[model samples]
Target chain A: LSLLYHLTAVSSPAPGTPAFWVSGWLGPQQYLSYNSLRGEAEPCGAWVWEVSWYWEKETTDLRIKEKLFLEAFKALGGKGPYTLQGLLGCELGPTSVPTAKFALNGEEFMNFDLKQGTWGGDWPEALAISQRWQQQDKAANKELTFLLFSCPHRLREHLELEWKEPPSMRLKARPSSPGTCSAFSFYPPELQLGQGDFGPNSDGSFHASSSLTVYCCIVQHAGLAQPLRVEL
Target chain B: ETLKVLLTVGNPISPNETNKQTWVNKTIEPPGAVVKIGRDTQHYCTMNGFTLITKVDWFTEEFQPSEEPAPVQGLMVLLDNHKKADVYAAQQYKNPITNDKQQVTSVFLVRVNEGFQVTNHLSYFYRNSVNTDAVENIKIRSATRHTTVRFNQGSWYLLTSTVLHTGPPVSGWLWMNQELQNDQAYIIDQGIMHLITPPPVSSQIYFEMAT
Candidate 1:
């Protein structure tokens, strides 16, 4: 699907919002498909690519213009090697093709007019546009807003959000008891202590002591089976 | 030479402290050893140095004491390792009752292991009874482990105690080193202990070993 068309149809700048439109002309552009498996570019002929993007925003507030562009960019799946180039409304003139204002990736030009013959055939022009838009804005300079929304490739379908109700809980057979049982108890045996013997020393202090013995056993009680189910 | 000493500790449960203190001492030295230590109504015990092994044989029977012998419920076991001044190894048993003929036995080995520190803890819910009418009020037991291990220059040793809980509504067990202070204990190794059971029955044992 053409990201430009999809985004344009869905994005809007209603009342109190900035106005936006595509900047560059739509025509045939060239792109190379690499095959890393074979470690070389595919021998097949260069593919012709068609793409577009909103060029400028008409709004008194720069923030509004930026907001409008951001919404459109996100809807377009914001990654690139996109054929069309978008420019800030302030960067472009009404008639003459003014010097490109932003340098994307490493390419200095923003909007490319195919008729100018500046870059060669469709493929060359597409590569040039891609190289320009592909610049990494590590510092995230606000001026390079155009590059911010450009995505390298289409997003995966799985990454897209799916809006649906969660599945209802299902009923399964209740867990069976290991066996019929009840609470078990550990019982200790009885204890016996012998009488103590007392003796008085010459100093008058007496000592008394007793001997005690005890025995015990760990008694197990069968646990009773009471079927039960609980929701975790 | 193998020496087995049986020691008994008292647990106070009643509001009134009128229960008499009980003392038990026995020594067995030979090729065959059978030692049993029982907890009073308040499940508590103390002992010195010795190897105690308890073997439990399950017979089929209903919850009633008078029912015919039959094996139905499973078993769970915990090992509490006590050291000189702290608790070394502590474990919990989370397993369903057995179904058929089952034998659950635990052997405790207390020895002086030169360079090891053990500190661990565990927390879990116990389903004690099944009451269909009052599900919210069903009998449940909650258990926690409070064993700590510390390393010092003096004499250091390791004590390993083991137990098995046979079947449904099994009681909870805790192995503690009450002698060890909280701050002195140091934890070296810790992880979950898996008992022998399938999906429907699973238990977690948190263990700490240090040197």
Candidate 2:
């Protein structure tokens, strides 16, 4: 089954212009600004959904960023599948940033000493971002997964600038037709469950054994962090 | 519910060991039924319930995507140079001494657990931490084998013996448990190896009963 996963970029930053975090990891503590805007025709919101299936204890599905030009649609508003859209992206598990030893886009993602000290002396000696970050200590093999989104912007030289304001970024959905582009998508709906699944079933009544796919778009800024879905 | 199956050591194992995989089976009945796993040997068991649900190997290799294709490494369990000491020293927070790294040689084994004192057995090997030229020493020193194992479960078993790095040292001892399933390792100044545990129901082997 398919479900519409809507994301509203509600950060205080102005529309069209997105900010980048030059140094440090992506979090509230590290927020940088960028200079680039796609010229606003109108403030149009984007929606992404995943069409998927459920088997046994696992869910397998595909998702794509939804293209609905003009007038931003209200967030899913806790909605379920009403129709099927084209599959833009397919992901198993969750979306995570690439953890290679080096960066593909010329960025120093991590280092050796930082890697060793991250997990005491017992850290895995590999050089992957996912491997270095200890969400669950040296054994984060099962608990967590990282989702990474890349934005399309042409820069002559890498700039390191601090933000005087809380820069707002836009996640533009591609045009309905092929060859159009946009920004980062929202978090998959499955992740919206908050504390994972509802409290254990007491009445012995089992929830529908089904899976819902929620596709997300790419955000403009590389190191931008915002709640997946915003109410705006 | 919970069901327990007792396994004997000497009797030849029947075609079908048990019906349900997850029913907490144990090898309690047989006194001499020591399930021995040799060096570099791979064995598997299952805890059946869900149709063909297999347990993951905690020892084989850390999870790395196929595209990357990095070498797979296991945990390293080391013994101290002292003898007749506790294999695991709670006070020092280190394993017991097997053989002196300078003069004599040592052998160690990696153990896997299943949330209890002991469970299934997997791989065994010799680790010579002395004689900088030894294989284990070379692997650890060169950093080519950079993988290390960490303990995520209960404790493990360790046996010690004397063997020389240059000349033939005494054959090392063995450490075996019944239940091991989490990815963990034991490391010391000398050497390292991966600790692996077998599952109640392993995806590697298929079992069927015969009349």
lDDT values of the candidates? Answer: 0.24, 0.21
Worst 10 residues of 1 chain A by lDDT: A180-189
Q: How does each model score on TM-score?
A: 0.16, 0.17
Query: Pick by lDDT: which candidate is best?
Result: 1
Query: Interface RMSD of every candidate?
Result: 38.8, 16.9
DockQ of every candidate: 0.01, 0.02
RMSD of each: 34.1, 25.9
Per-residue alpha-carbon lDDT of candidate 1 for residues A109-227, written as tens digits (9 for 90 to 100): 22333344222112223333333333423212332333222211221221241111111112223354453111112111111114435343332222333332322111121121232
Per-residue error for B69 in candidate 1, Å, reads 41
lDDT of 2 by residue, A130-162 (tens): 342443233232111211222101011122123
Give the distance in Å from residue B68's predicted Cα in candidate 1 to where it truly belongs. Answer: 45
Worst 10 residues of 2 chain A by lDDT: A62-71
Any runs in candidate 2 off by more than 4 Å, and if so which? A1-22, A25-119, A123-232, B1-19, B22-109, B112-211
Q: Which stretches of candidate 1 lie over 4 Å from their true place?
A: A1-232, B6-103, B123-147, B151-158, B161-211
**Poorest lDDT segment (10 consecutive residues) of candidate 1 chain B:** B190-199
How well is each residue in B22-65 modelled by candidate 2, as lDDT tens digits? 11222211211212222111211111111111131222123322
